[PDB]
Amino acid sequence: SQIRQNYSTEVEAAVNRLVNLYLRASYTYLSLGFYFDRDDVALEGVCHFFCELACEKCEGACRLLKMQNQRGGRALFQDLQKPSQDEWGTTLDAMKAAIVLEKSLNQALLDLHALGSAQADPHLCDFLESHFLDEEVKLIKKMGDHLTNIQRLVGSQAGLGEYLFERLTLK
Amino acid sequence: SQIRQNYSTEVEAAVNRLVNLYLRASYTYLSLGFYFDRDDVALEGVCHFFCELACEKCEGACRLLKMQNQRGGRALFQDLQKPSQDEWGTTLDAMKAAIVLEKSLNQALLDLHALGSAQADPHLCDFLESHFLDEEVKLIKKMGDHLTNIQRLVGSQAGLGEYLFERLTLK
Amino acid sequence: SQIRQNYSTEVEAAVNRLVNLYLRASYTYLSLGFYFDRDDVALEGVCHFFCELACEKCEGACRLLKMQNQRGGRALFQDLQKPSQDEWGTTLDAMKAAIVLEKSLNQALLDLHALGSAQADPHLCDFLESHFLDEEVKLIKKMGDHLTNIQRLVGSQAGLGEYLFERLTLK
Amino acid sequence: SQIRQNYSTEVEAAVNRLVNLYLRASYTYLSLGFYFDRDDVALEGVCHFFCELACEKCEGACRLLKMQNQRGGRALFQDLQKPSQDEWGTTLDAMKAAIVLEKSLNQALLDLHALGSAQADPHLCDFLESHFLDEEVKLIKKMGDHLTNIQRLVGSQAGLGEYLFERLTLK
Ligand SMILES: [Au+]
Ligand SMILES: [Au+]
Ligand SMILES: [Au+]
Ligand SMILES: [Au+]
Ligand SMILES: [Au+]
Ligand SMILES: [Au+]
Ligand SMILES: [Au+]
Ligand SMILES: [Au+]
Ligand SMILES: [Au+]
Ligand SMILES: [Au+]
Ligand SMILES: [Au+]
Ligand SMILES: [Au+]
Ligand SMILES: [Au+]
Ligand SMILES: [Au+]
Ligand SMILES: [Au+]
Ligand SMILES: [Au+]
Ligand SMILES: [Au+]
Ligand SMILES: [Au+]
Ligand SMILES: [Au+]
Ligand SMILES: [Au+]
Ligand SMILES: [Au+]
Ligand SMILES: [Au+]
Ligand SMILES: [Au+]
Ligand SMILES: [Au+]
Ligand SMILES: [Au+]
Ligand SMILES: [Au+]
Ligand SMILES: [Au+]
Ligand SMILES: [Au+]
Ligand SMILES: [Au+]
Ligand SMILES: [Au+]
Ligand SMILES: [Au+]
Ligand SMILES: [Au+]
Ligand SMILES: [Au+]
Ligand SMILES: [Au+]
Ligand SMILES: [Au+]
Ligand SMILES: [Au+]
Ligand SMILES: [Au+]
Ligand SMILES: [Au+]
Ligand SMILES: [Au+]
Ligand SMILES: [Au+]
Ligand SMILES: [Au+]
Ligand SMILES: [Au+]
Ligand SMILES: [Au+]
Ligand SMILES: [Au+]
Ligand SMILES: [Au+]
Ligand SMILES: [Au+]
Ligand SMILES: [Au+]
Ligand SMILES: [Au+]
Ligand SMILES: [Cl-]
Ligand SMILES: [Cl-]
Ligand SMILES: [Cl-]
Ligand SMILES: [Cl-]
Ligand code: NA
Ligand code: NA
Ligand code: NA
Ligand code: NA
């Protein structure tokens, strides 16, 4: 490569894996969003929340690909694994699955920082800081806030709570 | 002092103590507001209500300091005691703590009027009338209204009531 | 905590201490600002400079608290120590006290970076970079510039110099 | 009188005396303002400051007269004594004379509150609160601030200080 400078093969491979995780997360959120659009589930605000996350994870993948090319790395695409469930249960079940997924992305980001730090690659570290580390923390906080409100609303009338959360928080 | 006129040392000291109470109230409301921002509490409207009160109590302290200087008194700052709790329980527990705090400020204001009246200091009495006595009564009425609505919403489904109050009153 | 990830108890405690330092700095600047509003000191531009810094340090504390909650840490408030003086002397004395205070905050920020680096916490390091390290350097440079101009203006006519600095720099 | 109610002859007389003090203060400020317009004094900002105060004291007299008529009292005008000096010395001498005059008005206002309180006349007390007590405190604070700045500027070059104060504060 004519442009590549201070860009380890280890970072290049890790960036390709992270693209694959972001795209699988996008696909998962696509599945979650259509599940909540089913006529027998019918929680529009839950569909909107997950379809917006599908878009944000795709954007994360696009950003990582653009950065791979800017550094002289080579994008390599793998199979995208189907999402872990076909049916996602309650809003609560789905928001718990989403926070597990987000913590796994966050761990992949922290693991890529550790690799970039070991490889002395400050451009990579700046890239993760600028577009990923804070966005992921902000999203996990919001999902935690959602899980607390959903859990509060379960009590004894679970249908009522699920309706009210969708109507008054996911508006 | 070249400007001081009809301004008792007793009033001067009482004004400094009242600044300390308003600043401690501001600090308490800061603590209450961040408690309701915790991911395991997550009541945004409750956070907004208390952070707005932190701002209003700071404004009260600033007004008292400005008046101290206008009369030729000397501002003296003491330690600000940490708030009375680290964790504030339910919205109900927190609004009860806030109305106790407000009644204690109101009593300090009435005590300062009594001192100003005994010292024949009509400028002080006009100052309290203009910026404090009515604002405190209006705030305590609002907190009473809130406590009545929260209490009505407890019934048997406490989580549901706490969510609905935050969503539909503290909007 | 449902959200906490890669957030050391050591960082959590250090963040709470830093909130306490920012709030004590805010309180110090409140004291400095009202001292310069005294009828026997009467330097309006000096009052405005310090009251603006009281606001900026409070903002620093609020930002640190918001970040504590975003990471799943728990805000813990301590007593706020009264400022180090009741009377602050000349503009020069006050700007020297302010630069000592600012260097002590800056050292606390650098100490928190060192802890975050030792704990491999890149989100913390990004947070300090984004809202604190450059703001503190920019402020200390401005205070140095002020101290140089004040020192130049002392010569033999100290009252004249103090008036002119307040009128023509702190405008 | 068809309208008079709860309006003591003692208050009525005190209001007429206070009109006479406000008008004499207006006349004094007229004298001060023209002195600073003399070609051999020539401090335009000092002239503007005192002529504005002549206008404000006249407004005070007009307000007291309007209130006398609203209560069914009878305005009685006396001779207006010429001002205490023909020549007013330095800006410092003049601002010292102005703060003495203002403290004497303020004492007359406090004395009228004491009389109104003894006569159980809450309308009078509200009138003084609304238009006089705070305005007088705010003015005496400003004059104190001015005296501090003038005193700072004397040092060894009194002409230079007097010029700079007029140019940069009384702008
Ligand atoms: Au959807
Ligand atoms: Au949707
Ligand atoms: Au969709
Ligand atoms: Au996409
Ligand atoms: Au996309
Ligand atoms: Au994409
Ligand atoms: Au794309
Ligand atoms: Au890194
Ligand atoms: Au790095
Ligand atoms: Au969520
Ligand atoms: Au959610
Ligand atoms: Au949401
Ligand atoms: Au808040
Ligand atoms: Au809030
Ligand atoms: Au807040
Ligand atoms: Au404040
Ligand atoms: Au404030
Ligand atoms: Au304040
Ligand atoms: Au303030
Ligand atoms: Au009173
Ligand atoms: Au009074
Ligand atoms: Au309330
Ligand atoms: Au409330
Ligand atoms: Au409310
Ligand atoms: Au100030
Ligand atoms: Au100021
Ligand atoms: Au201020
Ligand atoms: Au603040
Ligand atoms: Au603030
Ligand atoms: Au703050
Ligand atoms: Au704040
Ligand atoms: Au760091
Ligand atoms: Au770090
Ligand atoms: Au400075
Ligand atoms: Au400065
Ligand atoms: Au400046
Ligand atoms: Au004039
Ligand atoms: Au004039
Ligand atoms: Au004039
Ligand atoms: Au007039
Ligand atoms: Au007039
Ligand atoms: Au008049
Ligand atoms: Au008139
Ligand atoms: Au009165
Ligand atoms: Au009265
Ligand atoms: Au003045
Ligand atoms: Au003056
Ligand atoms: Au002035
Ligand atoms: Cl599979
Ligand atoms: Cl304590
Ligand atoms: Cl101490
Ligand atoms: Cl005479
Ligand atoms: Na290199
Ligand atoms: Na008096
Ligand atoms: Na971790
Ligand atoms: Na009567």
UniProtKB/Swiss-Prot annotation, chains A, B, C, D:
Pfam families: Ferritin. It is found in: Cytoplasmic vesicle, Autophagosome; Cytoplasm; Autolysosome. Residues 52-59 are annotated as: Catalytic site for iron oxidation. Its main location: cytoplasm. The keyword Iron applies. The keyword Cytoplasm applies. GO terms for biological process: intracellular iron ion homeostasis; iron ion transport. Fe cation binds at E52, C55, E56, E59, C62. In horse spleen the light chain is the major chain. Stores iron in a soluble, non-toxic, readily available form. Important for iron homeostasis. Iron is taken up in the ferrous form and deposited as ferric hydroxides after oxidation. Also plays a role in delivery of iron to cells. Mediates iron uptake in capsule cells of the developing kidney. Delivery to lysosomes by the cargo receptor NCOA4 for autophagic degradation and release or iron. This is Ferritin light chain. It comes from Equus caballus. The gene is FTL.
